[PDB]
């Protein structure tokens, strides 16, 4: 009835939740195309729907498709629209896109996340880069491929997870890409809204499923705590108690049909007024959408003394910004190293650097590319041998328009250089700090965004979301590990791009120096420049 | 089908949106009790449903009930459960409570809001206090009266408005009580969740209805701008374009059925996993849930010079806090007046006050009760005659557990003393400042919350929400009126209760002095103390 005559594409349609979304969509009259990597599991599920639930064979199509590969996505969407080998009847359009597919990523503490295929250890099957492609790359690929074939009034439904906004020890390779997906979905709602295509996000809590109990078992083991501790923490956070199988009003997990019923509402015309909207299937867990504060003053640097602190600035190609940060830190007497991903930027910075009395030497310049982990680890070791430690780090983006009408290689470079690259850098720093203990004084990390791009900062928003959840879990893992066998890491993220004034760089540099050279520590993760500094 | 055999109570069920909620609920198999103040309109609508839509008479019950009167609410709920004169068949329970009733309040700029019945001018029919009772009092009353008769799995659906979070010139008597309702709903979700009763809030945008066009017509007139300007601003804010009656993909208002369809989803078991959740029926208007920042430093007072600034502290009964604020402002050389609602507090403060070199006289003490507007206006005039002006004001709460199991008079005193009282005070200050121009220098107002109540601060959250939206619209009205015929008002709200440390009062006083005595102005409305000051 409610999805009568609509064409739905459900990725991961044979998974634990996907099976229930598929079933409910069929009961409501949709024609469903289910995708997955395991072609047999798709065929078996399709057969069960036909043979045991009296579903007409024309209404279910099984289509193998690795959604992390844009070539496969385009080929599969073409088949759906025009017919093909695996699609017997051309379906002409997609009315509902359920971006439900999502791997679990490698389950490891940040220090242990595998970056290269040879590092992947049995329980896991994915590098960091593969997890990114199977979590946010996949949703991005399907939406770009499908959007030309979705008429006005169509519905894009992205499945994220509430845990993209909570502590989630040992799952940074999962929750940081899912946080990126949240910001991608909000940018897509803005872009597709002009076409009448709505884009909404479901955030399931822990859902009764083999998946959640497998993951919670692994996370209890990663933390060295008893079975059931991860679940107990989230059960306590729920506000809504609910009838369980024995009729008792208790804390319990929501079920897959709860998620499926939300997807039906969003797929149907009953949700026609919603876009860019969150749906938290969590029994009322109180989880903020963002941890943020706004600077309301400029700090005085006269009191800031970083004598004897080694501070590594990790830059991509941002010569002038990196040099300005180094100048400010050096005026506070810090021992500064600047690392550059881009060798041309490194050369340009050497020239620039050659251009009250102070006994502070000029910054050392090194090559530091986190996408070459073995060279990065060696560079950090050489710095430790020469300077004795690395106390703090400043992390800039990896490189200095539309989210849909964009070349495939621009999307791939963004995912690789900014998401994988930034998380890989944090992995390399965390590992180095664990391997080279330097006492109990916290290591401080400041992520700093790019400046305003004059075009809405759509891609910077995605990096911001990923970095916030990287920071949240890194803070928790490092605190926990420092008590239960090592210094903890405190981290924040400075957001420059909401301010477009000439004083922006100077204001940012002053706060970086204040936050690294003084005792002040800020609880909020994201630290925004004000819109007007003066 | 989806509400088969459920008992729904819909307040305002014969209004513009209520009629459509009622109709959809009946189509989905519910038995519906509709309430309103106009008994005839209810009877006429019930007759139309029976005579023109083939609805069985047993399934619709018309019940006149002014939901702002708790006595009437209890009597009507008793009738619904046990049967009575207007309820022929006892219904035994309430499965769905739709708190949809809501007046429009007096439509006036803050300076013109009617406080007393004789001030109400034709277009309007309500004082400020009546509007509060018809907007948040009503929802509070019904939920408390109905909750004992709602079994586990039941659903409370509160209709607020997105405009409780946006600019809305000339509607403070409407949007500030609706903002209070938002925080009341979140506290109720927490309290009722242990019983398995979920509580969710719908935030409609502008909904195609006689109501919205009547209100937008009045708001265009209040601002002296052309017909259609208010609507044009909100149409621009929508992200989702949508098919209109002629098949064009354009900006348009959502319809009443959009709101009704959301209420059906929330009434049905398909939403069983949702509580404390917002549903924004707005075509994706980007509207934050809160304007806030967190203090990340303590300010230096040595540079703060308020010489020649008259600052009025408006206190209820908070002797020690008011005196501490006065001491701090006087050490910054301000000319201080303290007003007290409570005459006993005024006497206690006189005794306390009698208890580097400075030439700053002790604070003047006056009676200032905003619920006696004629005496308040005279007091402000006498201060102006004696001291020459009132530059800035600090506003404390009117008085120094559960939201359900609470005596009726505690609820009534909170609504009257804190909500009506605080808005009435701002009305009195705004009017005084308009009547006694003192140049173009902005008047600054700092609302300051109570300290931590050690019990979750449920009532303080409600006042916080109302004050934030009071501030938002007051800032906009006063800015607009200062350009289009007068000084603008800047206001903020300091939140003390998230911090429970001994340094709390001193830290708060320092920021009050800094924000009133220096040039710094903060864009965010709510200014939170950090959880840890040191
Ligand atoms: N408690 C929960 O289960 C829970 C809570 C919050 C969020 N979620 C989200 O819910 C969604 C569904 O997961 P689930 O609970 O059903 O777990 P699941 O059983 O592991 O399902 C994951 C699905 O994703 C598919 N998939 C992964 N990578 C893919 C790729 N590159 N191309 C195509 N398909 C791919 C898998 O297909 P193959 O098996 O063929 O690879 C599988 O069907 C995920 O996005 C997950 O993050 C789950
Ligand atoms: N564009 C929109 O219409 C819009 C947008 C956002 C939010 N909303 C919200 O939607 C809800 C429904 O309003 P509407 O659009 O249907 O406008 P409406 O036609 O004015 O409906 C308001 C209803 O509230 C009832 N009511 C008011 N005070 C009452 C009291 N003390 N006791 C009992 N009933 C009372 C009225 O009943 P009587 O007529 O008998 O007094 C009437 O049925 C309101 O809460 C409103 O704030 C509306």
Numbering used by the authors:
A (entry chain A), B (entry chain A): 5 to 359, 371 to 415, 421 to 505, 514 to 562
Quote from the publication.
The crystal structure of RfxMCR-N in complex with NADP+–MSA was determined by the molecular replacement method and reﬁned to an Rwork of 19.62% and an Rfree of 20.81% at 2.0 Å resolution. Although the P6522 crystal contained only a monomer RfxMCR-N in one asymmetric unit, it was packed into a homodimer in the crystal. Although SDR1 (Met1–Pro292) and SDR2 (Thr293–Gly572) in RfxMCR-N had identical architectures, only SDR1, which contained the conserved Tyr-X-X-X-Lys motif, was resolved with NADP+ bound. Surprisingly, we observed an extra electron density that precisely matched the reduction intermediate MSA near the nicotinamide ring of NADP+. The carboxyl groups of MSA were immobilized by hydrogen bonding interactions with Tyr172 (2.6 Å), Arg175 (2.7 Å), and Tyr178 (2.9 Å), whereas the aldehyde group was hydrogen bonded with the hydroxyl group of Thr165 (2.9 Å). The nicotinamide ring was stabilized by a hydrogen bond with Ser213 (3.2 Å), and the ribose oxygen formed a hydrogen bond with the amino nitrogen of Lys182 (2.7 Å). Specifically, the side chains of Arg41 and Asp70 in SDR1 were flipped by ~7.2 Å and 9.3 Å, respectively, to stabilize the NADP+ adenine ring. Especially, the α10 helix (Ser213–Gly228) was rotated by ~20° toward the substrate-binding pocket to cover MSA and the NADP+ nicotinamide ring. This resulted in the closure of the MSA-binding site and shrinking of the substrate-binding pocket. In the structure of NADP+–MSA-bound RfxMCR-N, Thr165 stabilized the reaction intermediate MSA by forming hydrogen bonds with the C3 carbonyl oxygen, which facilitates nucleophilic attack by the NADPH hydride on the C3 atom of MSA.
Malonyl-CoA reductase (MCR) is a NADPH-dependent bi-functional enzyme that performs alcohol dehydrogenase and aldehyde dehydrogenase (CoA-acylating) activities in the N- and C-terminal fragments, respectively. It catalyzes the two-step reduction of malonyl-CoA to 3-hydroxypropionate (3-HP), a key reaction in the autotrophic CO2 fixation cycles of Chloroflexaceae green non-sulfur bacteria and the archaea Crenarchaeota. In contrast, green non-sulfur bacteria, including members of the genera Chloroflexus and Roseiflexus, employ a single bi-functional MCR to catalyze both reduction reactions of malonyl-CoA. Full-length RfxMCR was a homodimer of two cross-interlocked subunits, each containing four tandemly arranged short-chain dehydrogenase/reductase (SDR) domains.
